């Protein structure tokens, strides 16, 4: 009913399929956030740092980054603008070896460990 006001009802005719996206459930975000670390590996594939994130790390992210109303953009911001900050800092001086199986975890301490294992 809005596409016949704004979009001049022939557009309702001409378009084959009007897909309508749901807001993101939290069951998807265990995968959608997990996809971004694989795309984060593609930006560190020169550096050969393989960042592996488990669901014990994902749950801390969703609880403190996700509202449904914005559709999980700031969760994305929360990865890049917060936890990715001193992945960059620890690489500057000699603290990030270019071959470490980097892992993220929470001991339910409200505190993060990034685990470096060769």
């Amino acid at each position: 009913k809005k596409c016949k006001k704004v979009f001049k009802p022939e557009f309702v005719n001409r378009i084959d399929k009007i897909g309508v996206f749901e807001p993101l459930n939290k069951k998807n975000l265990h995968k959608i956030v997990a996809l971004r670390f694989k795309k984060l590996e593609k930006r560190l594939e020169e550096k050969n740092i393989q960042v592996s994130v488990s669901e014990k790390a994902i749950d801390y992210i969703i609880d403190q980054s996700y509202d449904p109303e914005l559709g999980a953009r700031p969760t994305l911001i929360f990865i890049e603008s917060v936890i990715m900050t001193k992945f960059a800092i620890m690489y500057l001086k000699k603290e990030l070896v270019d071959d470490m199986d980097v892992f993220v975890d929470y001991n339910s301490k409200a505190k993060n460990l990034v685990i470096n294992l060769s």
């Binding site: 603290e95 505190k111 470096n116």
Partner: peptide, 5 residues
């Protein structure tokens, strides 16, 4: 925290 070997 960082955990390095």
């Amino acid at each position: 925290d960082v955990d390095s070997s």
